[PDB]
């Protein structure tokens, strides 16, 4: 697993999608992101090691991945339909979710 | 890790919600189901062990957990809102997802 | 935009989906169901005409459609992917939602 | 009915959340946005009047509302729970959607 590695996968596969040529490239990218995001679910981050897993921050931290997992789920559907541009637009809109979690837990 | 133990978690906890006397017991059990479902997302079941990880069956398999994870998410909100009975309903409505996936790959 | 006709639309198109021969027949059916569900969202059922629209019953009632709308939304993706059978399965799975709402508000 | 009636409500209720006091003020405003979005789903904007209802921009348009509705839905929960801080957040993340869909039809 490892949290840092999962974030490597996310950041890298997002870039690919920004400069992807076709739907197939977008599928493969989003699919790998989905796996990293699901894997990162139960990772206790550095800045929350002193709290209980029952804490609001840990529930809020896990809540962030629910949002990310859902967006990728739906974004992959667009890719499967051959809609490269609206898949790329949805890939871009993950950033709002990425930034929100970082801004207060990273 | 073990997919068998992930289903054990999902089953056991679904019974816990079935008879819970307060929100805390529901919240906690739902949280355990979420971690299990997110764990099980990456797995490869027995009937598709030899088959490729990129097969239509495996795409639907992963998709089934995307639905379950998404339902567990909304249920937990309902529990967090103190709406215990509605969370218990929502937990019952998961069975459509459990059964649909079982009807085939189990 | 009557609630009875909206429900007539849901039930009739659910039958259409069961015996559909192509993706477009499923797409069209789901789109009609999507409209009926979006339309019925602001409705008040006979059992709660008396009650205020800000009551818990109406929140839970309206919330029922959020789920149905969400489920239809997803099943339409499956239809657009050419996954007709899985779209039919997802349609079959809607009845957990249909029955949950009827078992109390019908 | 009426597009402009629906859309003006969305930015107005945003400004309540922009600087609200409590879960009360936020929970109310969001529910009005939930009714505006569901009513807007069926509507046809002026720019793509000539294009078929089966247009791929009508689908971009409709799909854009499924995401807004879905995001409203989640912010509403956080407000019910008493997470007034996080409901604003989540309400902040709605902007990525608004301006995206606006980057064409507005
Ligand atoms: C929480 C809910 C998060 C979401 C959603 C995303 N990220 Fe994240 N990220 C998060 C944490 C707590 C950390 C710190 C890891 C650590 O051990 O310090 C990160 C880190 C990254 C990094 C690396 C930064 C570093 O200091 O090493 C990257 C490159 C990164 N995150 C990218 C990223 C992307 C692209 C996301 C969505 C598309 C995303 N993250 C979501 C917490 C969370
Ligand atoms: C696929 C998308 C699945 C979903 C969603 C759920 N389950 Fe499952 N389950 C699945 C498989 C492939 C199997 C077989 C595992 C094996 O190796 O035999 C199972 C098995 C179970 C079991 C039996 C436990 C065992 O001895 O292996 C239970 C009790 C079970 N599943 C429960 C369950 C519940 C409660 C679910 C949702 C609420 C659920 N499953 C979803 C595949 C999938
Ligand atoms: C509430 C959240 C509901 C959901 C979700 C669904 N239905 Fe429904 N339905 C609902 C009500 C309150 C009523 C009664 C309408 C009235 O004024 O009497 C209905 C009614 C129907 C009917 C008509 C049956 C009758 O007794 O007259 C049908 C055929 C029907 N509903 C079908 C249906 C289907 C197929 C749904 C999902 C796929 C569904 N409903 C969801 C409230 C709600
Ligand atoms: C499409 C998928 C849209 C989304 C999502 C949002 N908006 Fe929108 N908006 C859209 C259109 C096509 C129009 C033009 C309607 C018309 O005929 O005038 C609008 C208009 C507005 C307006 C009115 C502007 C004015 O006439 O002065 C407002 C205030 C507005 N939109 C706000 C708004 C907000 C706050 C949104 C999300 C939070 C949002 N819109 C999403 C298309 C779409
Ligand atoms: Zn979608
Ligand atoms: Zn777009
Ligand atoms: Zn909900
Ligand atoms: Zn209920
Ligand atoms: Zn889906
Ligand atoms: Zn199926
Ligand atoms: Zn949420």
Task: Briefly say what this structure is.
4 copies of one chain form a homotetramer. With 106 residues, chain A is mainly alpha-helical. Helices cover 75% and strands 0% of the residues of chain A.
Keywords:
homotetramer, 106 residues, mainly alpha, Four Helix Bundle (Hemerythrin (Met), subunit A), 75% helix, binds heme C, binds zinc ion, periplasm (chains A, B, C, D)
Radius of gyration of chain A: 14 Å
- Proportion of residues in helical segments of chain A: over 70%
The 3D shape of chain A can be described as elongated
Give the structural class of chain A.
mainly alpha
- Terminal CA distance of chain A: 18 Å
CATH level 1 class label of chain A = Mainly Alpha
Q: Tell me how many strands of chain A there are.
A: 0
Annotation field: number of helices of chain A: 5
Q: What can you tell me about this protein's structure?
A:
- The structure is a homotetramer of 106-residue chains.
- Chain A has 106 residues and is mainly α.
- Helix content of chain A is 75%, strand content 0%.
- Chain A has one domain (1-106): Four Helix Bundle (Hemerythrin (Met), subunit A) (Up-down Bundle), CATH 1.20.120.
- Chain A has helices at 3-18, 23-40, 56-80, 84-92, 94-105.
- In chain A, helix 1 runs antiparallel to helix 2 (23-40), helix 2 (23-40) runs antiparallel to helix 3 (56-80) and helix 3 (56-80) runs antiparallel to helix 5.
- The radius of gyration of chain A is 14 Å and the shape is elongated.
- In chain A, 37% of the residues are buried.
- The site of one zinc ion has 2 residues of chain A, from helix 3.
- Chains A, B, C, D: Residues 38-60 are annotated as: Disordered.
- Chains A, B, C, D: This is Soluble cytochrome b562.
- Chains A, B, C, D: Its cofactor is heme b.
């Amino acid at each position: 697993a490892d949290l840092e590695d999962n974030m490597e996968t996310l950041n890298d596969n997002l870039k690919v999608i920004e400069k992807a040529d076709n739907a197939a490239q977008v599928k493969d990218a989003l699919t790998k992101m989905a796996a990293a995001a699901a894997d990162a679910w139960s990772a206790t981050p550095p800045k929350l090691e002193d709290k209980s897993p029952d804490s609001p921050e840990m529930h809020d931290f896990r809540h962030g991945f629910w949002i990310l997992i859902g967006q990728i789920h739906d974004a992959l559907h667009l890719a499967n339909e051959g809609k490269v541009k609206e898949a790329q637009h949805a890939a871009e809109q993950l950033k709002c979710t990425c930034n929100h979690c970082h801004q207060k837990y990273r």
